[PDB]
Ligand binder design. Structure first.
Ligand SMILES: O=P(O)(O)OP(=O)(O)OP(=O)(O)OC[C@H]1O[C@@H](n2cnc3c(NCCc4ccccc4)ncnc32)[C@H](O)[C@@H]1O
Length: 375
């Protein structure tokens, strides 16, 4: 019975605590990942991203149920459970002995097998320089190896162990550029049909994810696509994460609610009234809100019904896009406008489309957008 098989993982009310009598960083967490899914892990500074990955490996006091391919984490040994995962970057353990042993601790592999994995992870040349090749003894914690060499050995170890779930704890951050690329290369090659949990600080190097997993305060929401994350951020953090330049935020007051709508007024001496195709639940009339609108979605003057005007402070020419920073006097703040593929000072005018406005409460959470964006 070859385990793991696909890479599917289910989580039921997970509680991760560092000390037996400490404080729980993750209260009660449930989710499920389909086999062979590349999942982006997101969260605010300190929310518990690294802790989740540490809880997967059971490296702290853990309560609840984790299951890979319908097998619980309670009827299997730590080292067997950890063999299912390929963790890089990793606290590198280089064992006392030879290259062969460090790659194949169980002695369960042919020398030809070891060389094959070594070659595909770029270790062939690293091993060859040393007298005994595979027979060469690695002294003093593997002090002849660079940081990257050591990570490639952890990786090779996992390819050889045939791991099925990969835990990338900010790889681009903690790796050599030359090492990091090989990791991405073997990711689409050796671990092509594997669950990958990419955790990083920038969406630029997460652009290829089928799924996302964002850590809230108590729950973990999961977005089925980049499109979902872009159009329907369930909080103000997620709204700022995707799309550049950042989403414009406007302070607004709720003048009215409805059944499936919310009305707000602009913060300005112009204080205009506008309805928003946004969920009405948990919205008290009079409350303070933050209206979100992307620079991408802002219409030109001649187009919309709700119009704004101001003097241009910055015209940023990038070639494939043009960024217009408009200092609007009506509203006491700037408004960044954008359009695909006009100098500083002159009066610009932008239209704000109610259909594509996000709405955020004081706490940060978003009122669900009801407008159905195609795709
Ligand atoms: O990396 P960021 O900044 O983007 O944020 P994040 O990834 O969402 O946050 P995490 O790094 O998960 O940190 C989340 C909280 O968990 C606590 N915490 C984290 N590490 C802690 C620790 N480590 C001791 C050694 C150890 C033990 C077992 C496993 C790994 C490390 N011993 C005790 N408390 C530890 C601490 O209160 C942190 O504020």
């Amino acid at each position: 019975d070859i385990w793991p098989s696909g890479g599917q993982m289910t989580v039921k009310d997970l509680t991760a605590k560092y000390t037996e009598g400490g404080n729980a960083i993750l209260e009660n967490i449930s989710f499920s990942i389909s086999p062979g899914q590349r999942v982006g892990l997101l969260g605010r500074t300190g929310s518990g991203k690294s802790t989740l990955l540490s809880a997967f490996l059971r490296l702290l006091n853990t309560e609840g149920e984790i299951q890979i391919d319908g097998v619980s984490w309670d009827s299997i040994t730590l080292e067997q459970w950890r063999k299912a995962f390929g963790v890089i970057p990793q606290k590198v353990f280089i064992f006392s002995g030879t290259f062969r042993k460090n790659l194949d601790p169980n002695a369960a592999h042919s020398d030809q097998e070891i060389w094959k994995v070594a070659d595909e992870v770029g270790l062939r040349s690293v091993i060859e320089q040393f007298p005994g090749k595979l027979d060469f003894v690695l002294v003093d914690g593997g002090c002849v190896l660079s940081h990257g060499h050591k990570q490639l050995m952890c990786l090779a170890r996992s390819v050889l162990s045939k791991a099925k779930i990969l835990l990338l704890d900010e790889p681009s951050a903690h790796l050599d550029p030359v090492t990091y690329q090989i990791i991405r290369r073997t990711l689409k090659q050796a671990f092509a049909d594997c669950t990958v949990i990419l955790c990083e600080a920038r969406i630029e190097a997460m652009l290829e994810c089928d799924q996302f997993l964002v850590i809230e305060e108590n729950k973990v929401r999961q977005y089925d696509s980049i499109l979902e994350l872009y159009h329907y951020p369930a909080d103000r953090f997620v709204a700022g994460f995707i799309g550049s330049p950042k989403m414009n935020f406007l302070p607004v007051k709720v003048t009215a609610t409805a059944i499936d709508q919310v009305q707000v007024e602009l913060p300005m001496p112009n204080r205009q009234q506008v309805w928003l195709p946004v969920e009405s639940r948990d919205v008290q009339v009079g409350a303070n809100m933050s209206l979100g609108i992307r620079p991408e979605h802002l219409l030109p003057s001649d187009i919309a019904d709700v119009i704004l005007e101001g003097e241009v402070q910055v015209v940023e020419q990038l070639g494939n896009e043009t960024q217009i920073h408009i200092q609007i006097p009506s509203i006491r703040q700037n408004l960044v406008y954008r359009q695909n593929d006009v100098e500083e000072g002159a009066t610009f005018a932008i239209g704000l489309p109610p259909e594509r406005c996000h709405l955020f409460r004081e706490d940060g959470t978003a009122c669900r957008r009801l407008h159905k964006e195609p795709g």
